[PDB]
Amino acid sequence: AMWTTNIIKTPRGKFEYFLKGEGPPLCVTHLYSEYNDNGNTFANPFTDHYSVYLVNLKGCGNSDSAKNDSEYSMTETIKDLEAIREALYINKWGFAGHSAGGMLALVYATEAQESLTKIIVGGAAASKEYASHKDSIYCSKNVKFNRIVSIMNALNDDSTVQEERKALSREWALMSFYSEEKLEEALKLPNSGKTVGNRLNYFRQVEYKDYDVRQKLKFVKIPSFIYCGKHDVQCPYIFSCEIANLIPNATLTKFEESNHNPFVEEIDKFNQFVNDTL
């Protein structure tokens, strides 16, 4: 039940990834996070039914670093994932992503759906318009906006002192969980996925302003399993509704007692969700 550490060489570079589980192949990654062999709490439930490939992207963990900023783009990321898939001699696999990882899932589908058995898309949006919605913490109309800007800026500073980083991370987590009890319990689970500054900066400064796949989603024909916490304050629930409506063969699963982290906030229901993607 341990995550295996792997290094794979491809024509597009060397990548570190972690394997756990038996069953159909499922790729899991995030747009700006790095993992270790503790695995990840979003990826872990899938290991009950899938062979899960938890990938460190360019600039993450022990994968190769980027020689140019363009290597961080979602398009280039998909090309990297496709090279990994090919190097594993896998014809088709699933892709599962949460939040920014969910946006990456949508781009995988629009660029290369023929390589995908399905997508699983959590707490995401089909365009940049989530950050202009008054129910998002990223929107200036939202009461939390000013505080969140301050927190994000401080967390993105490598000079921020340990005690301050600890406090800010706690504050962020509490905003991101419906139940304080569920947060405390989630912290006992093995986890990894530290923010990668290079990749976050690229998303915020370059990728975000051009992000919109709404029209292309109408031509995504693969099984698409969309989910979101009812109380998510990052990409509000309506944006998952939009995704599920636009994709012809999509389903939508609502997590009524979850904010941003249904996979640990409603473990039993999330397990049922995983089973239902098969």
Explained architecture:
- The protein has about 280 residues and is of the alpha/beta class.
- The chain is built from 10 helices and 10 strands.
- The strands form 2 sheets. An 8-stranded mixed beta sheet has the order 1-2-5-3-6-7-9-10, sandwiched between helices. Strands 4-8 form a two-stranded antiparallel sheet.
- Helix 8 links the parallel strand 9 and strand 10.
- Helix 1 packs across helix 2 and helix 3 packs across helix 4.
- It is globular and about 50 Å long.
- The relative contact order is 0.16.
For the termini, the CA-CA separation is 21 Å
Q: How would you classify the helix and strand content by structural class? A: alpha/beta
Outline: globular
Strand content: 15-25%
Instruction: Predict the CATH topology of the largest domain.
Output: Rossmann fold
H/E series: EEEEEHEHEHHHEHHEHEHH
CATH homologous superfamily grouping of the largest domain = Alpha/Beta hydrolase fold, catalytic domain
Q: How would a crystallographer describe the biggest sheet? A: 8 strands, mixed
In CATH terms, what is the architecture of the largest domain? 3-Layer(aba) Sandwich
The CATH class of the largest domain: Alpha Beta
Number of helical segments? 10
Protein name: Hydrolase, alpha/beta fold family
GO molecular function: hydrolase activity
Pfam families: Abhydrolase_1
GO cellular component, one term: membrane
